[PDB]
């Protein structure tokens, strides 16, 4: 005899679930016995045992016996009817990143402040079996379990959900975690990631990142380092063989400062391309410590002379960044040195040509978040003459 | 030539430090050059370069040259004059516990919210060299470094202090961490740890823990599992060969609930004994969920009958603890099962004798902290008769 449930063995709280049992095509009456608590249970070689509303009293192990003319038959295969949604959901994150190479392992972390017994990792699919881990107490408070995932083969999507339960009720689980998707990244030609805005972004500006491909990718995914999830847009192909997508991030805040990569995939493939070259988004006006800029000889100089730009601060910044107005390339970063009661970096422009003329600004930053910058220094005009 | 500092190379902020240089017993004048910043410095084959108050301008590398009749001599051994106390101190803890076996390794953890570059571990001693590690960003925020310590030989004390600094100022360190001591535990005969109070302690009661030894230990250390530090008392010997110490913990709070062990050491030895048998301190009245106690047949029973005490709760406790009034042994713990809309544990007293009569109480607890209990149930009187 067999025992199963039509919607599934994992049922959310307060939703219908039907249990079906199968005999040997000939039986007078079936009986259902929950393991331990319920003695009796009752409700065409099949029997229907409906539960209009799933509650914690129905969660447990179920067995089925069909009574034939010769007597009671063998016990059926036990069925775990799991209820979910009884506790606040856990958190689920990828340890290095949700981006993993095609093949190769990675770690997922279940996490909650109350899940001190067991965690369950479920993978989206058809006949996927859950994995259980013992919970671990963290030094800073809370509980976590680290699930090894891999090798991540690019034959299908990889989506996961976290659960926790307690020892006394093994079939009563918490609310599901937010799903997390894992992207396998291959060796296909990388896209190109370009920014439409300047090197350093003022708060409130509009930012649009643009991916493009000369091999004709249909989907594009933009991922920022250190985040849980990614963005996803379809690719536009006005001309065949050259696709592109735009990621409008709206008014920029401090959370928009970071390192960005984007990936492309074809129409019927779950494998993604190699990452683009990283793009760094810098946000000015995040630190109120001041910086100043000054030319060591002077603003007005002659060609061929030794000119040094000095960005200095009374605060102990970690690095300084020099930007030229009109320049599209990323700013030049230099570590700070401790001088005569100041912290400074020297930006050598020796020998000076006529192409070095323009407006310069400098910024300070700390290594804790090297994408959040200070307010710009007062602009400096470098004048050159033959 | 040599270069050193009398108080030491690690000097707290705003304290005197003196730098001495030694030549070839014959030199007209010594000179001191700080690496990079200061060119000149000046202030019987020795020269005294005093610093009335140590500041961050004096922190760096120093070299000494003595000028003889034949010219300048070789550069001296560079001296790293380190200033401490410039930042808030980090935290320092032992990963499993400060108790380690004699020999064998352990891990110390430096920790701060700002130490994102480097951490320094200093061991107390005469000529101990500091160890530096790169900082690691934590998922929950903050920074840490994990230092391998071992093998911990019981020839001396093991005390450590944590520091952090930044890349731009390598010789400017934070305030020292609180010192942490490591105790090597050997295979000497374990002490005995007894409690003067009952099994379960009500909040506000006085608790005194008592260690004792029949081998004549002079020092006693009491350690509670999961803590950073330990307690330490000298042992009293009214009679030779039998020492003891009392650990008065005052009015008990929730922080007094835990697992306790204590160790003993002799007068001129840094090796400690084997741990005592663990002692668990339970604190009642910490959980406001209710438990109740009832005899399944009834309070009044006859000897030889089957009697079961049932502690149950509407709340989903993890375990139940049965306490008999007057009993000195620890309470009996049983996991809870899910019943007819209740959670309960059955405490079998079948067959019942005349020694089972008395007053019984039951408590609930959760596995997150199994030493914090609920309020006691209403007392039950078990009456037996022949």
């Amino acid at each position, epitope marked *: 005899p067999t025992l199963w449930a039509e919607p599934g063995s994992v049922i959310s709280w307060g939703s219908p679930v039907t249990i079906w049992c199968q005999g040997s095509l000939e039986a007078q009456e079936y009986r259902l016995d929950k393991e331990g608590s319920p003695e009796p249970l009752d409700r065409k070689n099949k029997a229907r045992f409906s539960i209009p509303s799933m509650t914690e009293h129905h969660a447990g192990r179920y067995r089925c016996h069909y009574y034939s003319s010769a007597g009671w038959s063998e016990p059926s295969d036990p069925l775990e009817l799991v209820m979910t949604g009884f506790y606040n959901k856990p958190t689920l994150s990828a340890l290095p990143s949700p981006v993993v190479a095609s093949g190769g392992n990675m770690t997922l972390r279940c996490g909650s402040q109350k899940g001190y017994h067991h965690f369950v990792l479920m993978k989206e699919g058809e006949h996927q079996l859950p994995r259980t881990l013992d919970s671990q107490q963290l030094h800073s408070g809370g509980f976590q379990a680290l699930f090894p995932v891999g090798p991540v083969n690019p034959s299908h999507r990889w989506r996961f959900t976290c659960y926790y339960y307690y020892m006394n009720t093994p079939q009563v689980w918490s609310h599901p975690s937010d799903p997390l998707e894992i992207l396998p990244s291959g060796v296909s030609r990388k896209p190109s990631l370009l920014t439409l805005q300047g090197p350093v972004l003022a708060p409130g500006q509009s930012l649009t990142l643009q991916c493009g491909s000369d091999v004709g990718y249909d989907r594009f995914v933009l991922y920022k380092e250190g985040e849980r999830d990614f963005l996803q847009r379809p690719g536009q192909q006005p001309q065949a063989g050259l696709s592109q997508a735009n990621f409008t991030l709206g008014p920029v805040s*401090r959370s928009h400062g970071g390192q960005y990569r984007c990936y492309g995939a074809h129409n019927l493939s779950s494998e993604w391309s190699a990452p683009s070259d990283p793009l760094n988004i810098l946000m000015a006006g995040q*630190i*109120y410590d001041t910086v100043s800029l000054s030319a060591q000889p002077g603003p007005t100089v002659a060609s061929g002379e030794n000119v040094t730009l000095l960005c200095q601060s009374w605060w*102990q910044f970690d690095t300084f960044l020099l930007t030229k107005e009109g320049a599209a390339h990323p700013p030049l970063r230099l570590r700070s040195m401790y001088g005569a009661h100041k912290y400074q970096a020297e930006f050598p422009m020796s020998p000076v040509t006529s192409a070095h003329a323009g407006t310069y600004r400098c910024y300070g930053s700390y290594s804790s978040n090297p994408h959040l910058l200070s307010f710009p220094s007062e602009p400096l005009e470098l004048m050159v003459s033959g | 030539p040599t270069l050193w500092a009398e108080p030491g190379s690690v000097i707290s902020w705003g304290s005197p430090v003196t730098i001495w240089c030694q030549g070839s017993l014959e030199a007209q004048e010594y000179r001191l050059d700080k690496e990079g910043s200061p060119e000149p410095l000046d202030r019987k084959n020795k020269a005294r370069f005093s610093i009335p108050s140590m500041t961050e301008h004096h922190a760096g590398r120093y070299r000494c040259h003595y000028y003889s009749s034949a010219g300048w001599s070789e550069p001296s051994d560079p001296l790293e004059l380190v200033m401490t106390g410039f930042y*808030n101190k980090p935290t320092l803890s032992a990963l499993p516990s400060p108790v380690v076996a004699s020999g064998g390794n352990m891990t110390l953890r430096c920790g701060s919210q*700002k130490g994102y570059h480097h951490f320094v571990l200093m061991k107390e001693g005469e000529h101990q060299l500091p160890r530096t590690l790169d900082s690691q960003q934590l998922h929950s925020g903050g920074f840490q470094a994990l230092f391998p310590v071992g093998p911990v030989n019981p020839s001396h004390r093991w005390r450590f202090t944590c520091y952090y600094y930044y890349m731009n100022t390598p010789q400017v360190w934070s305030h020292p961490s609180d010192p942490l001591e490591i105790l090597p535990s050997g295979v000497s005969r374990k002490p005995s740890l007894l409690t003067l109070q009952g099994p379960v302690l009500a909040p506000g009661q006085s608790l005194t823990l008592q260690c004792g030894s029949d081998v004549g230990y002079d020092r006693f250390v009491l350690y509670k599992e999961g803590e950073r530090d330990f307690l330490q008392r000298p042992g009293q010997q009214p009679q030779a060969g039998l020492s003891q110490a009392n650990f008065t913990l005052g009015p008990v709070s929730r922080s007094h609930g835990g697992q306790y062990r204590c160790y003993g050491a002799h007068n001129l030895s840094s090796e400690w004994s084997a741990p005592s048998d663990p002692l668990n301190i339970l604190m009642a009245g910490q959980i406001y969920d209710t438990v109740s106690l009832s005899a399944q047949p009834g309070p009044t029973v006859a000897s030889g009958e089957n009697v079961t005490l049932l502690c149950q709760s509407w709340w989903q406790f993890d375990t139940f603890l049965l306490t008999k009034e007057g009993a000195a042994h620890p309470p009996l713990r049983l996991r809870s099962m899910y019943g007819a809309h209740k959670y309960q544990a059955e405490f079998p007293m079948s067959p019942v004798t005349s020694a089972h009569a008395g007053t019984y109480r039951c408590y609930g607890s959760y596995s997150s902290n199994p030493h914090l209990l609920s309020f006691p149930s209403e007392p039950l009187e078990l009456m037996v008769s022949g």
Partner: nanobody
Amino acid sequence: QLQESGGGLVQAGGSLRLSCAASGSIFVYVPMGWYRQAPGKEREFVAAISLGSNTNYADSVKGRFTISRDNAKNTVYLQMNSLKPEDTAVYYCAVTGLRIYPFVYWGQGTQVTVS
């Protein structure tokens, strides 16, 4: 967090003293000082002092304002002298040099209306 004092207003050539007391965390090791807004303008830097008793002064108030610190009570003082009319602003007590987000701790503000 931060509590300010010594507000008000005076005529040209007058003198006012600002005070700022700190509570809630460790503020011994970071610089403390004043920034000021203005009608239609942004927050500039005015003055600061750190643990090593080193002072920082904006060029517009150099040699006119004096900052002092009490390391025992985490309290800083500003001694404004020769108050010019362009000092009319809302001065903010600031804890800078945090090196991490939010990089600053601001005071609720005080009004100076030198006219």
